[PDB]
Each structure stands twice: as C-alpha cells, then as structure tokens.
C-alpha cells in the first residue's frame, strides 16, 4: 500500500475544500473533495455514452460516436438523442477535467511543492475548450465542435481542415507544429543525455553533470543546463498547445477563406508584385 519512503509524507492538511472529511487515500489514490467530484463527473459521463450506445444500437468502441447538435439548433439546447447527450457529456467532461486540476493542487499543498503541474494541465483544458466551446460559440453553433468517437473525430479533423483548403498554410499552425517537433527533439535529447551519464561505457564510473554540459558544448557549442532544459521542455510543450488553440480560435471566426491566400501580404507588395520571372510572376 505504501512506498518504502511514503509513510512520513501522508499527513493531514492541505485540502482546499471540505477540511478533513475527504482527506484520505484509497490505495495509492488520494481523494480530497475534488477526487469525489472527479469520480462523480466521470461516473455520470461514462453512463451517458452507454445510453448513447444503446440508442445507436452497437457496443463495439470503434463505431461508438456521440454527435453534437445539428447546425440548425444553433447554440440552444437539443434533445438527448439529437445532440443533447453530447452537451451534457461535454459539461461532465469539463467538470471532470477542472476537478482533476484542483485535486492536483491539493496534492501539491500537502507535499509542499510548486503548482506547476496543474498550471501546465490547464493549457490542455484550454485546448479542449477551444474546440468544444470557444470556437463553436463564436461561430454560433455547437455543431462545429468535434464528435466523441475514435474514428469520427478523426474525420472531423479531416473535414474541418480541408474546408479551408490546405490547413498547412495557417501561420499559427506552423508555429504550433514547430514547437511540437522541437519538443520531441528536446525530450529525446534530455532523456538520452541523463541516461548516457548515469549509464556510461562498460568499465567506466558514473559520469557527472559536468560531462553532460561538456557533451553538448562539444557537440553544438552550448548547453542550457539542468534547470534550463526543464524550463525549456515545459515552454515548448505549452507553446505547442497554446498556438494549437490559437490556430483554431482564429479560423472560421476572423478568417473564413483558404489559408493559401493568407501569404499575399508578402507576395503582392507594391514593390515587386509586378516584376516578371520567378514562380508567381
């Protein structure tokens, strides 16, 4: 039930709500008031899919798909079988996600550590809300959000993207992608670096953090440091998700056309928008 060093940390206190009423553990899991809330939102949400699967008539997971209301319903309430369930599930999902973050905060207080983890998780919540709340509301219909299905939500991504031609040309898109790639790049490098120092060549002693700095300075001429790389990794991942939500909040709201045409404010400048030759001319 306990890690060999765990007992001395499991003390009372740190709760944000409910005092000591929900201040206990179930196995490894900590509860807290938001633990009960999380379980409550999750329980109801899972039940809703089951009743959606019954109406759909199937029970294999790879076809189960809970759709939002039709566009004609606008931003109003819908019947359960015609987008209503989706609305309630989304409410439960949002409730479940937010509760999870607040539960992490309670754990942070009891351990006397920073609040970086739920803060970072908040970005993930922001991205989800961008697709299911912010963008649909700004466009005036819940139907612009994605369906809750394994393959159908993939189609939503496929359908939404091509609606604006080639979605590659979204400038906020490129930035988000660049951070996603760079993040995987930094993750691989950081993991490899630490492991290579802790697990050196055979017949060699364990290396020092001085070797890690020296390796990258020999390699690229600079090392950011042990503290800086974790700062960097957090920034890269957060920035990737931030611009991700950004690239979606501006499409279909302040921009309705094909992203191919965005790049005209460079090409068709009144300096060179007439000079013959080249690809465009």
């Amino acid at each position: 039930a306990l890690l060999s060093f765990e007992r001395k940390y499991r003390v009372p206190g740190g709760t944000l709500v409910g005092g000591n009423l929900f201040d206990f553990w179930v196995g490894p899991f900590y509860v807290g008031f938001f633990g009960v809330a999380t379980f409550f939102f999750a329980a109801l949400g899972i039940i809703l899919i089951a009743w959606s699967a019954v109406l759909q008539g199937t029970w294999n997971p790879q076809l189960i798909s809970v759709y939002p209301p039709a566009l004609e319903y606008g931003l109003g309430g819908a019947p359960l079988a015609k987008g209503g369930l989706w609305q309630i599930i989304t409410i439960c999902a949002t409730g479940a996600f937010v509760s999870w973050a607040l539960r992490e905060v309670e754990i942070c207080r009891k351990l006397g550590i920073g609040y970086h983890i739920p803060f970072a998780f908040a970005f993930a919540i922001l991205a989800y809300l961008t697709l299911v709340l912010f963008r649909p509301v700004m466009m005036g219909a819940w139907g612009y959000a994605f369906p809750y299905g394994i393959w159908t939500h993939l189609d939503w991504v496929s359908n939404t993207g091509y609606t604006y031609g080639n979605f590659h040309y979204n400038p906020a898109h490129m930035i988000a992608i660049s951070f996603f790639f760079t993040n995987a790049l930094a993750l691989a490098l950081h993991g490899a670096l630490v492991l290579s120092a802790a697990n050196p060549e055979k017949g060699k002693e364990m290396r020092t953090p001085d070797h890690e700095d020296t390796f990258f300075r020999d390699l690229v001429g600079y090392w950011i440091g042990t503290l800086g790389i974790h700062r960097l990794g957090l920034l890269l991942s957060l920035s990737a998700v931030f611009f991700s939500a950004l690239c979606m909040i501006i499409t279909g709201t302040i921009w309705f056309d094909q992203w191919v045409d965005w790049w005209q404010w460079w090409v068709k400048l009144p300096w060179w928008a007439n000079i013959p030759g080249g690809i465009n001319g």
Partner: peptide, 25 residues
C-alpha cells in the same frame, strides 16, 4: 507520526512539532 485509524488509507498525525521532527511537507 501516529496512526489515525485502524484501517487503510487514513493520514498519520504528527506526535510533536512537524517542522522540527521532519514530517509531512
């Protein structure tokens, strides 16, 4: 630290000064 309940999953309360005894946070 002192056990708060017979059963599994409940917190352990400090018997003295938690900061000085080095328990919890």
């Amino acid at each position: 630290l002192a056990r708060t309940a017979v059963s599994e999953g409940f917190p352990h309360a400090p018997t003295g000064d938690p900061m000085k005894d080095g328990v919890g946070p």
